[PDB]
Write a protein that binds this ligand. Structure first.
Ligand SMILES: O=C(O)[C@H]1O[C@@H](O)[C@H](O)[C@@H](O)[C@H]1O
Ligand code: NA
Ligand code: NA
Ligand code: NA
Ligand code: NA
Ligand code: NA
Ligand code: NA
Ligand code: NA
Ligand code: NA
Length: 859
């Protein structure tokens, strides 16, 4: 009934192509004969030309269909086109196709990472064990993932871990380094042997990613060092262990690629370069040299928390075959019109003429609801080509990265909804448009009508309503985040909401340059719009009141769309009901958000004109916002375990996610309610007493601290020299700080060596640390969660006293707090000029010393 002939040299990938073509033929009637009436010839060439990689031709000639694969991936993707054409038409006549993928690497990532740190381990550190990661040892579950990967014609799988080597390689010189028992090493060995075998037959490259500088805890416990400390120098020993470990990994897993992050535990770009050129690359060559390999297989290097151009500039004489990675829209998905300074980084990395991989990273602003908008994804990949000059793709899970393999969805009696079931369209869209981006958009709505229809057992025409829900709801998180968001970072969980404070005083919640300038069409923040209204300047670009208008029409339409289609389902009906609850969530969130912003404008108008009417107007709008948030909670309280999957104190917006708190809509309603109580109390006091609450400014009393590493003390007051190497003393100093006992360091010595403070305290203290506001690189940069997970370990992420210190012929400084228990402490501050102004047991009150900001009405 149907012959399937396989021609030439076997190879695992030709076999697999045949295995898959057989399955689908039988799976639809049709009897078969395999070999070397109606025939399909699978032909495979040897073709070196880097031009025809992953390419296939399909022609037909009477009763005989021919698939030419220019290489192993090519024949696989040839057989995929037959199968898809079969899946979409009745028939077994085949439309001729001559085709190759546009993007040369197309791939996705699984974090061997957890929602929370692990006792005795720092951020990103999770040994490969069945205790932490049962799912990693499940072969049934790997074949399901890999088949989804091949079906979407993705050719790369990236495993993300802080320090994977201690789980996978033994070193004679460091045999105590090992982070797993003997039985767990054997299973790691079996599971990588099986992963790479099974990925290979499917044309999938397996890529192990690691951060730096991180060592094993046993390695650390023995030598007396930490597993990781961002600002600690490179040492021969840590270097020797990392080098031998990579040499080992290469020898043992010759077909597994490496994705290097030169972060987040390396303090300067120079140390970033020393590490890659003197430790990693020498290590990769040790392995190649043992394997007797003349060639240089590609090594992948991220832009994250390094100077991408500096590091490739430095490395290419040592190793030709570098590929680069950079985030698409930072740690979120905001636009298909990215631009500005982040575009240029992409574009310089891209203008090497190698591979440059767009990382759709973390999707903080999508967590945790269903998101898979064909149109948004198509337009995005097109921007990757035209703006960013990317020619490859790496994609995170749509949501719940940190909790693989499960979505955050709450099912009856503790059943966990799985991520490969829920987010199929996500993987299928990125995969589709990575293969070919320019596809007739109307032709595309038919294909997606049938994809959503097949899955729910609905006709395509009725299923078009499912596509609208996805494309209408899909614009909401991106628009709100680029236009009102504090950060593209997972330091923010957009879909829990924002306080009025964060709408009327965004700069107080720290907004790094490059976010608003890159992750959307230009346009005004709410404070800029309102400042423009009161000063009668014209408005330029994308405006906040337009967006909230767009965003509630997105909500209304997505709801009207899914509500038509939801009871038609012959299949996955329970899932379709969770999609409908999701769209009602996005609608109530949109309306909550709309009314809140509207109220914020009204409080900003009070800021500029001091009309009381303005504040009165805000109350009804805050009530209505709260109504819609109360409606959100009913929908979420029985359908979601949480929103954010990073459930640590690295989550700062809308508030701390310390110890896993403040990770549900229910918890947030408690704080949003309090918000309005305070507001209506503050209004009432204005209307009786005509007084507001403002900071009372009192000196911080000096803690009873002893210093263990013989620092020089200085009193902090106008004139004190906190730098020994400049003649300039202090010429401005916040009243809070004067009196305190701080330290004198050599700024030159701080560039080369940093700043170790070693002290004991008999009750809890805050150390006050001055970071100078100056792009000159001689200055230590302030802590920054976006680049550095440990930047809130002492509660130092955001500053307490801004514009609080000036030294003559240096700069202005913000004061940051480093909070410590009673105990004995060592801490290395970033290389560069910086101040240490002393220690207080006292409560610290946030103040902009320059100044009364519009957001005391909420406190
Ligand atoms: O890019 C990275 O690896 C990191 O980026 C940080 O900003 C984020 O908070 C981390 O959880 C991690 O995703
Ligand atoms: Na057909
Ligand atoms: Na351990
Ligand atoms: Na990246
Ligand atoms: Na809830
Ligand atoms: Na925490
Ligand atoms: Na002392
Ligand atoms: Na000056
Ligand atoms: Na402590």
């Amino acid at each position: 009934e149907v012959n399937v002939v396989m021609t030439g040299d076997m190879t695992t990938r030709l076999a697999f192509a045949g295995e898959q073509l057989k399955q689908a033929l039988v799976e639809k009637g049709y009897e078969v004969n395999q070999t070397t009436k109606r025939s399909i010839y699978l032909n495979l060439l040897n073709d070196t030309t880097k031009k025809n990689k992953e390419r296939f031709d399909i022609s037909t000639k009477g009763k005989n269909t021919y698939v030419t694969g220019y290489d192993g991936n090519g024949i696989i993707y040839g057989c995929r086109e037959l199968i898809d054409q079969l899946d979409q038409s009745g028939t077994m006549d085949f439309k001729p196709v001559s085709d190759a993928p546009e993007m040369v690497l197309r791939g996705a990532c699984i974090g061997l990472q957890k929602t929370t740190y692990l006792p005795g381990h720092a951020v990103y550190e999770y040994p490969y064990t069945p205790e932490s990661f049962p799912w990693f040892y499940d072969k049934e579950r790997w074949i399901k993932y890999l088949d989804m990967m091949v079906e979407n014609r993705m050719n790369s799988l990236y495993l993300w871990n802080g320090h994977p080597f201690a789980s996978l390689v033994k070193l004679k010189d460091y045999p105590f380094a090992l982070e797993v028992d003997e039985e767990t090493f054997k299973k790691n060995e079996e599971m990588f042997s099986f992963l790479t075998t099974e990925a290979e037959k499917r044309g999938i490259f397996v890529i192990q990613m690691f951060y730096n500088i991180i060592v094993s805890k046993p390695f650390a416990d023995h030598y007396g060092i930490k597993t990781q400390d961002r600002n600690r120098p490179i040492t021969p020993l840590i270097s020797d262990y990392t080098r031998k470990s990579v040499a080992a990994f290469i020898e043992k897993y010759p077909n597994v690629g490496l994705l290097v992050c030169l972060g987040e535990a390396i303090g300067t770009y120079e140390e970033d370069v020393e590490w890659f050129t003197k430790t990693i690359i020498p290590g990769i060559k040790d392995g190649l040299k043992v394997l007797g390999r003349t060639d240089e297989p590609p090594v992948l290097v991220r832009a994250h928390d390094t100077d991408c151009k500096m590091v490739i500039d430095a490395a290419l004489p040592l190793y030709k075959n570098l590929y680069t990675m950079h985030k698409y829209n930072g740690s979120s998905l905001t636009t298909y019109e990215p631009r500005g300074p982040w575009a240029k980084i992409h574009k310089d990395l891209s203008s090497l003429g190698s591979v440059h991989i767009s990382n759709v990273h973390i999707l903080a602003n999508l967590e945790p609801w269903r998101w898979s908008s064909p149109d948004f994804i198509q337009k995005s990949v097109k921007a990757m080509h035209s703006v960013h000059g990317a020619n490859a793709l790496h994609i995170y899970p749509q949501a719940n990265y940190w909790d693989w393999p499960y979505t955050a969805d709450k099912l009856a009696n503790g059943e966990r909804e799985e991520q490969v079931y829920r987010d199929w369209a996500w993987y299928k869209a990125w995969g589709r448009y990575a293969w070919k981006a320019d596809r007739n958009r109307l032709e595309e709505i038919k294909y997606w009508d049938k994809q959503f229809g097949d899955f729910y057992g609905i006709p395509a025409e009725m299923a078009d309503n499912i596509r609208i829900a996805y494309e209408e709801s899909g614009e909401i998180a991106p628009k709100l985040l680029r236009r009102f968001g504090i950060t593209e970072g997972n330091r923010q969980t957009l879909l829990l909401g924002m306080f009025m404070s964060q709408f009327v005083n965004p700069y107080k919640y720290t907004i790094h340059y490059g976010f608003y300038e890159s992750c959307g069409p230009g346009g005004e923040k709410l404070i800029e719009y309102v400042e423009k209204e009161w000063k009668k300047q014209p408005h330029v670009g994308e405006l906040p009141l337009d967006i909230i208008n767009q965003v509630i029409e997105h909500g209304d339409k997505a709801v009207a769309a899914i509500d038509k289609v939801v009871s038609s389902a012959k299949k996955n009906s329970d899932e379709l009901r969770r999609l409908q609850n999701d769209m009602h969530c996005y609608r109530e969130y949109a309306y909550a958000f709309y009314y809140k912003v509207k109220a914020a404008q009204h409080v900003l108008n009070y800021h500029w004109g001091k009309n009381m009417d303005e504040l009165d107007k805000a109350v009804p709008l805050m009530e209505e916002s709260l109504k819609h948030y109360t409606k959100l909670v009913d929908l979420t309280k029985d359908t979601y375990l949480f929103a954010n999957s990073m459930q640590t104190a690295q989550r700062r917006i809308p508030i701390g996610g310390d110890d896993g708190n403040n990770k549900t809509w229910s918890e947030m309603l408690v704080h949003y309610k309090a918000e309005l109580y305070n507001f209506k109390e503050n209004i009432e006091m204005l209307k009786d007493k005509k007084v507001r609450k403002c900071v009372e400014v009192t000196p911080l009393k000096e803690a009873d601290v002893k210093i263990l590493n013989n620092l020089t003390k200085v009193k902090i007051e106008k004139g004190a020299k906190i730098f020994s190497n400049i003649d300039g003393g202090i010429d401005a100093i916040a009243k809070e700080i004067t009196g305190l006992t701080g330290f004198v360091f050599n700024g030159e010595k701080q560039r080369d060596d940093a700043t170790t403070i070693e002290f004991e305290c008999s009750s809890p203290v805050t150390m006050l640390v001055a970071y100078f506001k100056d792009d000159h690189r001689k200055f230590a940069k302030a802590p920054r969660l976006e680049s550095d997970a440990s930047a809130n370990d002492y509660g130092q992420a955001e500053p307490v006293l801004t514009n609080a210190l000036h030294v003559k012929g240096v700069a202005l400084a913000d004061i940051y707090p480093y909070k410590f228990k009673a105990g004995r402490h060592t801490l290395i501050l970033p290389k560069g000029y910086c101040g240490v102004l002393g220690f207080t047991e006292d409560k610290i009150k946030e103040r902009d010393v320059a100044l009364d900001a519009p957001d005391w009405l909420f406190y």
